[PDB]
Design a protein around this ligand. Sequence first.
Ligand SMILES: [Mg+2]
Ligand SMILES: [Zn+2]
Ligand SMILES: [Zn+2]
Lengths: 589, 197
Amino acid sequence: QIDYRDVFIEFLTTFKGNNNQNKYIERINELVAYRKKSLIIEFSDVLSFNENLAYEIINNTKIILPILEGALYDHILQLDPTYQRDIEKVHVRIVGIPRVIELRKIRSTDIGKLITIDGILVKVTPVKERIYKATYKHIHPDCMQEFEWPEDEEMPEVLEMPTICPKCGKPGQFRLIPEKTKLIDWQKAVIQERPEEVPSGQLPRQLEIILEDDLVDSARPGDRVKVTGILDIKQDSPVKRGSRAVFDIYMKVSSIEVSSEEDEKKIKDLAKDPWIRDRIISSIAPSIYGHWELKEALALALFGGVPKVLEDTRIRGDIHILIIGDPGTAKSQMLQFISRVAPRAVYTTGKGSTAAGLTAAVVREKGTGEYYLEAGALVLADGGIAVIDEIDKMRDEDRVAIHEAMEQQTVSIAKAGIVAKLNARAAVIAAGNPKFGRYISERPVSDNINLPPTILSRFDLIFILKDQPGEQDRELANYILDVHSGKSTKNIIDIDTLRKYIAYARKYVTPKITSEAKNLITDFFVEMRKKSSETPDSPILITPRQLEALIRISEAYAKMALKAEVTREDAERAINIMRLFLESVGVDM
Amino acid sequence: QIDYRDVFIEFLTTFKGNNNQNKYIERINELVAYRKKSLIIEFSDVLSFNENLAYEIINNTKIILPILEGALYDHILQLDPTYQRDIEKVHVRIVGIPRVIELRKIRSTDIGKLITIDGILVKVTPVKERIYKATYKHIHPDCMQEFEWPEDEEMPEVLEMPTICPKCGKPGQFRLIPEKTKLIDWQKAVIQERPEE
DNA sequence: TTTTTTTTTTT
Ligand SMILES: [Mg+2]
Ligand SMILES: [Zn+2]
Ligand SMILES: [Zn+2]
């Protein structure tokens, strides 16, 4: 009854934020400057300003939304006439709806209402075009007339062809005219419920969502997203008569969120502590006793180095870690922790993986007999971390796919007439067991781990964990029992804060190596080569590839402390950890 | 509105090249020598010579492109009468269009406009034949009449047959006549975006 | 092509 365009338009112009900045007028600025055509409004902000406007949006969404969109378009038109003839429609998207429903708990009462669902994006289709206003021509020698068939409305989800010519009243043949046909961008994605919500003994459920217009290509597979929109029943084969009055539900997306100022302030305060590096290392797997050297290396892999593109070749910034340890050395516990704290990570197992599942799988579209690719584990981990457990138990045919990923950071696909090269810039963390149960110190690493030497040289660091009973057993027993009793360590950065800290560092920090750091690295290398030249009788090689690892590790240390330069201390720490690896593999100085 | 046919003809014959050599005349003569039927021109040269002509090409390529080809064809046959009876339709192609769109960035607003794409060829089908003007015969014991169904219009990409015989005004069964059907070479290729982008 | 269990030939 009461028009809400008046209260809405002044709400945009008059609204004060946390720091008294008038965000919405600032947000609407680049909407006309950069031609976004889409606006984002928080539900809490609208509710505080006027609850009547807020509750009208949730309930009467299908009616108030077109009215509100028209009001904002007029506001932009008077503010900048240049918007006309450029963008003819503006979308306003609402986020933060309190009505959040689990994927498994959707029932018939929620159809046609604005709801929000949290899940994981698993499938994305290529962008396509959908007709919303067609133009036909009547093929009848008398007629030769053109008209817009879905008059006075929009073309439904089912393409319907006119049966009677509206301009002559006769049936016959109608020809589509693509030149005058109106189109709109259209994409389809599949969302899956998070593993924490799956009940015992059940399999995860999936929901189909539709992204249209500017919402296309707003997310990548494997991302955790929050999606808001309207549920509706799905019609795909109306002509398939005969039983089956049962339909599936699909979601019509109106706004999507992936995964900000106070958090940035909190991150900066943490970096101010001189001992921030020690705090971060102590926060890695707090429930595991000892393994300080391994924890330090795992922290470096989370941040990584800086990739370099030379005149001819490319230098990866990712760090590869290989762990060999006796059974029960808590190898799998840390890898689970790493996969949970990293902003983007994929956890796999040697036995539960295949070559197609790791890189890309060809799927034949039985509906049209068409071939298309599906992203594998390594592709989904691009820009993140790939964790592989029990690498020694993987099949040889499935292991060769990893060889290219670690070396060239690429995956080559040539099958079913599809040829492509895929980026796989991901850090690889692998764990394995020795051949004969426990580890034999006297024998070299190569004959004690059951892996080809061609894959050993591709790892930046290798660590050996030995479970030898000794005087530390009492400390280990006391620590474990305290964990089972609920006792927790203090001064530990929590998972959520740690994940945000890593994401910020990987995005805004690019350390540069100073002259002093270069001299220390060079001097260590050349003196090591001279020492190694006397007697290079070790299973572990000392090739110039080790020099690149020293560069990567030093950059990671600087990035951990949010520093823009690599100083003497960072280079010194990188040498120490590299020196241990060059000697803990069974070879002395 | 303004007939650019004269402007196009003089532009080709009076194009100041790197040394005012009128290289367009040189390639036109080369085209006549080997019967190439395809003339390519640079958008920069057209814009420099007459920016108004360049805008019309890049904006109304659906309408004015056949007009320009007709003007070029008349000039070629006038220059050399032996070109007839060999090529009935010349081709003019534009290169260097400033409107460059990334393949992933294509949206609905770019449909029906002249754009350029950079990528990698992955698949190429063998050369085939496409019908652009068919001939049909009405199989109805009183007709025995032949006609070209797509009257005053090129045959659309969707093969459609007449429903009512135009010559006799009756429905029935129609048979295609391959011997009186116009054909054009047709090939399909797939382009893939570069891994860098 | 792809994962799976099965009998079969042939990688
Ligand atoms: Mg384990
Ligand atoms: Zn009609
Ligand atoms: Zn007839």
